[PDB]
Each structure stands twice: as structure tokens, then as C-alpha cells.
Design a binder for this molecule. Structure first.
Ligand SMILES: O=C(CO)[C@H](O)[C@@H](O)[C@@H](O)COP(=O)(O)O
Ligand SMILES: O=C(CO)[C@H](O)[C@@H](O)[C@@H](O)COP(=O)(O)O
Ligand SMILES: [Cl-]
Lengths: 160, 159, 159, 161, 162, 160, 160, 161
């Protein structure tokens, strides 16, 4: 698969959330790369990643971070590509800090924000597919089939 | 007409007008409509079912309180849906924000800041989806960002 | 079958089972079913539409996170809908609660406690609705209350 | 006939609770409205709840703010359905009242609506939905209300008007 | 002699409320402890509150969680000072308990303490500070409790101790 | 004869704490009211607390907002009952004030009342409930105030 | 001599940050103030942080609201102490600003003060306490500021 | 030479504040660690803050939880910089700790860091940034600490294994 989505995260500890993103991208046939890019510890690398993403052929960036979560916003500041933000569940405040740090962007620089934790990691991937589908038949198909199968799974198991 | 801007009531217009203003400035075609998830549920379903074949590429949906409009629209279209939490009078949009962003795995809504900020940013995010296949939008967005940057650099000492 | 007990997903069963248990204890006919607002939106609309003609008098709906199921069922039936916020793993049901209870004026949802307490109480409130027309349910509910009172008066010493 | 009791802790709740009464007025439902304080008139409170059923009330709608105990205590003392409206406190924007009403432990339910006027209105509309089952006038009036709110959106689609 | 009434909505509050009683014991203060539910035994709760003063009680400590109404409804039915302990609720970690107790409007006070066992302990120590004014031995015991807690920290300054 | 000390961290707390003092005046209870800052006058605050019992005070009522330390630090320096009134902060509507006062660890209690003027009123009424035991005049005036407020609601049942 | 850089995300933050500047003036501390937007002028922000030490700045005070990333991103790019002032957001009363600034994971600290003008004033006062070691005039001026504020409460005990 | 005083309200804070001291050790900064309770040892508290400067301290790092008053009260009684660490509380996950420390009114500042271990570590690292001007060895050690944390991310980009 050609490499269309960049999945980045603040530290290695985030993997247990962001893998669930990568797993879905994999299931949908979507080419991606994943990298640890810290906004606070590797600020220059973060700018360089953001700046070059479009000319490296990426179409969407999914960024995950926790606590004072700046990674998605600062990446969005340095690329015109759509940036999707995953608030990672923080051990002290259960991701309330993550969520507000990402979602409350003032006007001018957007970050599309999804649910705290794994659910938003999964949804970021599916939203990335809904971006890439307009341009890519197999990804359009794969997303259609995912939705059809999740719908079937609930229709087939009505008795709890 | 590539963007559908919708909201639960006319009371949301003071917020969503700002979304529309940015789409105009960027030369992006849009329609704007009151579509209530609770009071016009059948029209909400129809709207969402037919958006793609009507040629819409993104839907931007605002709602406050128990804000169900974005999520229910996303349930019924594969187009990307952008959720704007409208500031509630009682809880300052905290209800709006959680009701929109906390979608469980399977049906995503891209959520932006509470109020006017999220409205603008939704228009600007839709621009970044649409630039990929239209160079007039790429020009217009580049320029928008160029100008907002220039604006800040022109006024450095606030005294 | 007078009470429809529904939920967004199977994971909600550990909560919603306690609702059904109460209805059993009180001799109230019910059905329980997984109906997803986001994954089976058409089925949902259908369930809500046909509920009255199928004989249901009340619908009890549980959901967690961005909890849209009760509001949307309420939008599509004239029957009273009771909302149970299910405890979400990240925000302890704060999101579920606000997503259910903060309905704007026009379409109500009667909301109960987050978690098991709300599930049990939904079932009891449905009994309080249905007692008006059936003496056996009135007796059952009066007995349940008497039992819970006796349980505390007879066990006054925590030591 | 007087089928719904609308009660509240204090007259300062009236600006919220009046919106509940105006909706019952419009649906042609008979009600009484009354200040009954859980904290300042606890005995009258118990009395009101105790006698509601014999007085012919079918539903009680109770509003309060702060440490809002009125809905839960009435519910403790009557088998009638009680609806709880969290009144917007000046300090925490009704978050205290919401939790105080909605977080009832298993055994004594209170049907809880939205903080403030939205909940007040919805409380009334929800009382209509309980009462409709045995009052054709009420079934009619509630269907006309929902038809109207639906029509109003369909006929005014363009917010730029 | 029985001067403090310790009450709570349910037996599941005992793991918290037991800590209150332990302190009352240590300070030599007479008390009774009883489950009295505002929602399931509202009439017994009125009865308890009503009769407290004429039964010789001087303070009531009430614990409850969730939509915690016990402390405030007791306070509405007695002239005695009532101390409220918010019990840590499973769902909202006692945030519901705390607001349902402390946010009483003007007219009927409930002195409120910290969520959970910290508040249970402090409710007892606070009742001791009410009673000390007319009870010499309780004054003595409270002085000594405070002296001993100060000494414990003075004797253990180095957190690396092992 | 002065039995209640009413203190507060700054003059701006007066619009709240005046309501405490006004109830004390109506119940016939002697008090003094003083600006005592935990952060700007810590030595005076220690001294006030240390000498309160000696000066004849039976109860201290302390208001503060924000990072509200006055009630708790006074309680640390007297064995008298200390009543805390969280004053409504401009930024967080008294949430910071409430948590700063009520969440005392075991060992040093502060009796905490509602945020703002309702808490100020109730601290006074609660001080009365402590003082009534040893003073029949305070017991009578408190009893009347409750009978008054009950009768007012009872006599005005129609809110219109 | 310019030792403190006072920066803010936008002109609208000046209503808050002016109070910081006013206290620096009173303390006789040289400072500069500049609008530096993390999200709209990211390159300028990296340059400001990078060049601060060589320009002779000793402390940076950064104000921001919403998803407030300015203080954290400046701190990532300079080893100077960075003080963060959460600006009161119109929507969430600065709760988002506060969590966005204070919740920095281990590695890159930001010293955080109160939401709003309280924090703006205290950041100035705290910058003075860092600088006082290095300058006897700043040390005396801080000493006096405190002496005055203390005296002001001792001389004015009656709140009525 | 002891330049930083690390204090805490009780022994149950050590699991957090130990992480602050570890970092001071790694940076070669002299410090002392002490249990000083604002509520149980208020006099010792005042004396500790009073004498800080004359005993050679340049910065105080104070940790506390719940109604966390230690950091603010020490700042009211010394002219030295005080750093505040919110200790995670069992009931409210350090939300009380944070607000009790950070929301200091104008006049007496406390520099506040993240709730818990993250904040304890960052207190240490912020203290080092105050003191680096003073000792070229401390500036070297802080510069190296940062380099090391950056290297760990730049050299380990793929989180997969
Ligand atoms: O003081 C607190 C917590 O001690 C907060 O003000 C509460 O309001 C919080 O529990 C949120 O509640 P909801 O958002 O669930 O209503
Ligand atoms: O996300 C929510 C919704 O429940 C809140 O708005 C946060 O603000 C909360 O985490 C409180 O934060 P503090 O009270 O710790 O500032
Ligand atoms: Cl920023």
C-alpha cells in the first residue's frame, strides 16, 4: 500500500492506544507510517515532520498525546494537511487534560478531535479512511464493508 | 456545493454563521440549513442518506446540550462529518462537547472547539480536505494562513 | 410485553440486566434487545416507530459515552422513554449522563442515575407508570418498597 | 381536573418552574403550583407527598437548586411518579442540583430532566406523555405540540432568513 | 454518656463511618451508630432527628453518598448541629455526595467535611471540638490527640527513614 | 460579649461575609469581624488563632476564595471550632475555594458550608447551633429564626 | 536592562498580561512584551525561544488561552525558566488554559500560576524572586512590595 | 552545599517527592528532604520558611495533597521562590491538590507543576534552571539531561518491536 497516513505519538507509552489506530488502517488497506515524535522533547523533529509531510506524499496525519497535549496542534500549525487528534488517557485526570489541550484550538488552526483513548484512536483511522475514500476506490470499498459488517454484527446478536 | 452546513435550530446561527463566512472567503460552495435531530428526525436521516449523491463532500453539523445531530448524521453517511459544539447557556458547552466527541469506536465525528472558534475551524478543516482536488481552494487557504500569520507579525508590541 | 428494554451494545448488559431483573420480580412483561443508534440507525427508527402498535407502554434505553440512543428513540415515539446512563471507562459516565439528560425543550428523556442504580430505578419508575392501570403491579411495587424499608429497619446496627 | 402537582423549594424557582406550568396550560392539563420547601417546611413536604394520590394527583413535578432534596424526598413518600427539574443555581450553574436529583441510589427513582427552563418544559411534556394513555384530549394536545415543533423547522429551513 | 448520634444511609457506608466511631471511642466520647435511610426509611429518619435533643444527643454525624440527602433532611428536623460526611460514591468518587451535602441554601446548615474516611475522622474530631466546651475530659482528650499527631511528625522528619 | 470571630482574607470578601455578620446581629450574638490574610499577614493570622480561646471566642468563621487557606491554617492553630465559607471566585465560581477548604486531611477539621452568601448565612446559623447549648437566649433566637422561615413559606404557598 | 520577556498568543491577551508588565515596572525590572502566537507564528515562536538567552533574557513569561501551547513550546526550546499564565477563556473560564499549561509530562517544566490576572501579577512577582539573587535593587523592591501589601492589611482590619 | 529544600506534608507523599530528589541527585544539586506538615506542625512550618534563606536555601519545593496549603503558606513566609507539587489524592485524582496550590491570589506566588510524579520531576528540573546561572556544572548537567531525553526519542522512532 502507498504511504498516505502518518501516525505519530508523543512517547512510546502511547503505543498501547495508537496501535488500535494502526490496526484499523491495516485492515482497510491504508498505507501508513508510524513514528514517535515528541512535541516537548523533539520539537525540531516535530516541525520537520510536519513541514515535509505533504511533499512526502502523506494526505492525513493522526497525532496522539496526553496530559498537556500539544503535538496535534503544533503539527497542524506547520502543515496544511488535515490533522486528527487522539487524546490519550492520562493516568491522573483520565484524559480530560488531553481532550481540552487538543480540542480547544482557537480559530485559524484546526485539529479534528476524537474520543479519549482507544475509541478515538480507532475513530481517527476510520475518519482518515473517509477522507481518502473520495480519491481511492479500494479504500472506499473497504470502508463500506467495515460499516456493513459492524451493522451486521449487531443485527445478528440482538439478545444480550 | 461541496459542504453542507447544518444545525439543530436557528438559535445556533450566531455560532454557525462564522463557519459560513469562512467558506465564502475561501470560495467554497456550500448550503446551510436547520436540520433538527430531535424535531425533524426523518429529514435528518434523508439529508444524511442523500448528501453524497447530491455531491456533498463534507458535512459540518452544530448542536448544543445533548448534541446528537453530528453523531446521528455520521451514522447515516460515509462522508466525513465535522462536529461543532454550540455553547449551551447552562453548562458553557461542556455537555455539547462530550455529547459530540465521545463517539465510541465505529462511527467517527471530527470535533472542534466549543462555539465560534470550532465553527471557524470546521470551515477551515473542510478546506484542508477539499484542497487536495481543487487548486483555487489550495491557493485560498494558503493565503488565509499567510494573512493570519502576517497579521500577528505586523503587530508585535501590543502596547 | 409492556416495557421495551434496549441498549446500544452487549457490553451494556452487565448494567441493563439489573433493570430486567426488577421487571421480572414485579411481574412486568418486557423484552430486552441490543439496538444501536450509531451502528443500526434504521433498526432503531423502526423499533421506536412500531413500539406503540406492538403493545409497549414504556421504553428503557441505556447507552454510554456519546449516548444518543434514548434521545433519538424519544424523537421517534410518543411513548415515555427512560434513559439509563451507562458507566463509561474513561469519564465514569459523566459523558453518558450529560448526553442523555440535557435534551432541549420539545422531546423529553426521563434520566436516572449513572450505572446500575439508574438501571434498577428505571425499572421501578416504569412500574410506577404502569401501576395506574393494573392492581397486581401496584401491589408488587408497594411490596418491593415495603421489603426495602423492612431490610433497613430490621438491620439498624452496622456493627 | 387537577392531575399534576408542580412544586418548588422557593419562589426564586418560579422563573424556571413557570415555564413548566405554561406548557401544562397550553396542553390543557390541570395542575396546581405550590411552594413546598424540603428544608424549611419538611412536615408540609411529607404531608403533600403522602396525600397526593388520594387528592387525585397522578404525577408530581418538583424543582429545586443547590443541594436539591425536594424531588427525592417527595419520591420517598409517594408511589406516584416524580419528575425532578434541576434549577440553575447562581454558583455552579445547576451542576450541584443535577447531581443532587439524578444520582438517586436504587430503590426510590426520580425522573430527571435538563438543568433550567429546558428541563421545566420537558418535565411538563413528559407528564403529558404519561397522562395521555388515559386522556384523549391530552394525547391530541401533545401530538399537536410535536407536529407544530416539527412544522416550524421544516418551514424555516434557511437560517439566513 | 451518649452525646453523639452517628447515622448513615446504608450498611455499605460502614467502612467509612466506622473510622468516625473509632475516633469517638479513642476520645472517650459516648455515641450510638445506626443505619437510617432518608429515602427508604424517611419516617424513622424524621423520628430520629425529632427526638435527638430530648434523648440527650448534642451532635449528629450523618454520612451518605450519591444524591446524599440524609445530612440535610436531619438538619431540617433538629436544632442540633449536624455534621455531614460525603461517602465516596463508586461512579463519581463522591463529587455527587459532596455537592448534595455542602450546597445547602441559607436557613438550614450542614457542616461538611472531606469526601470519604478523611471527612469521617474529621467529623468526629469536630464533634469533640463542640463538646469540649462543657466536657473537661473531652477537652483533655482532644488536646492530647492533637499533641500526639504533632509529635508523630516531629519524630519522623526524614522521609527516607526505613 | 464577643463569642464569634468573623475573619476573611481580604476586604473584597465583605460583600459575602457581611451576610454572616448580619445574621449574627439578628440572633443577638456578639462578634468581631476582621480582615486577616493567610498569605499577606501570616503572623497576624497565627496570633489571632493562638489567642482566640484566651480572648473569649467560642467559634471562628473564616471566609476565603481561590486557593483558600485561611480556614484550614486557623484550625491548625486553635482547638476552637472553625467554620469555613468558600467565597465565590471570579474565575472558577468558587470550585477552587470549596475544594481548598473542605478537603482537609484527617487531623484538623474545618466545617465547610456552601459557596458564597448561602454558606456565609449558614456558618452564622451553625455558630448559633453551637452556642445555644450553653446560652438559653441564643437557643430561643435560633428557634424563632427557624419558626419565622418555616412560617414565611407556609404563609406564601402560591408563587405567582 | 531587559531580563524578562513577556509574550502572549494574541493582542486580546493584553488585558490580562498588562498586569504582569505593570508589576515589573513597579519593581524596576526591565522587560519586553511581544505577541508570539504558537499556532499562527510557530517559526517566530521557535526563534524567540532560541535566541532569548543570548539576548540576555533570564526569564520568559508566556500567556495563552484555550488549547494553550505557547508556554510549553517555548520551554521546549530554551533552558531559561518559563512561567505560564493561563488566560481566562470565554467558554470554559480558563480550565482548558490551566490544564493545557500545567499538565506538562516529566522533562520540560512550566511554572504555572493562577487563571487570569491573579496569575499575571504573580508571574511577575515570581520572576522577581528568581532575579533577586542576582540584583540587590530587585531584591529590595520585592521586599518592599511585600512589606506594603502586608502593612495595607494590618492598617485596614475593619472591612465595613 | 544544600541549595534546595524539598518538603512535603506527610510521609504518604514520599512516593511522589522521591522522584524530585532523584533528579536533584542526578544533576549534582545539593538538597535536603523533610516532612513538614502545614496542618499538624504549623510552627515548624513557619520556622522552616523563616530560616530558609539564612540556612543557604535558594529554592523550596513543597508537595501536598487534598486541601494543599503547604506550598502557599511557605511562600507567604519566605522571599525565596517556592515550587508547588500537587500530590495525587485518592478521592479527586489531585484536582483538589492542583486548585489548592495554583489558584494563589495576587501578592504571593507559587510556581505550580503537574499533578503527581511528573510535577515532582519537573519541580526539580525547574529548580535547576533557576540555579544553572550559578554553577557551570549545574548548567552542563541540565543541558545533558535534556539531550539525553531527546536522544531517547530520536534514536527509538518506531514504537513497534
Ligand atoms: O466541584 C466539583 C468536583 O468536586 C465539580 O464542580 C462538579 O461539578 C463535577 O463533578 C462535574 O459534574 P458533571 O459535569 O458530571 O455534572
Ligand atoms: O472536561 C470536562 C467535562 O467534565 C471539564 O470541563 C474539565 O474542566 C475537568 O477536568 C475539570 O478540571 P479542573 O477542575 O481540574 O480544572
Ligand atoms: Cl497557545
Amino acid at each position: 500500500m502507498s504511504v498516505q497516513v502518518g501516525v505519530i505519538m508523543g512517547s512510546k507509552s502511547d503505543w498501547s492506544t495508537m496501535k488500535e489506530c494502526c490496526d484499523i488502517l491495516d485492515n482497510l488497506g491504508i498505507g501508513y507510517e508510524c513514528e514517535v515524535v515528541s512535541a516537548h522533547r523533539t520539537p525540531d523533529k516535530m516541525f520537520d515532520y510536519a513541514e515535509t509531510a505533504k511533499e512526502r506524499g502523506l494526505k492525513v496525519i493522526i497525532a496522539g498525546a496526553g496530559g498537556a497535549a500539544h503535538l496535534p496542534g503544533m503539527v497542524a500549525a506547520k502543515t496544511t494537511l488535515p490533522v486528527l487528534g487522539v487524546p490519550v488517557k492520562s493516568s491522573t485526570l483520565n484524559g480530560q487534560d488531553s481532550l481540552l489541550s487538543i480540542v480547544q484550538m482557537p480559530a485559524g488552526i484546526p485539529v479534528a478531535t476524537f474520543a479519549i483513548g482507544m475509541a478515538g484512536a480507532k475513530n481517527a483511522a476510520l475518519f482518515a479512511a473517509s477522507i481518502l475514500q473520495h480519491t481511492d476506490i479500494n479504500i472506499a470499498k473497504a470502508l463500506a464493508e467495515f460499516r456493513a459488517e459492524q451493522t451486521r454484527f449487531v443485527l445478528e446478536n440482538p439478545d444480550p
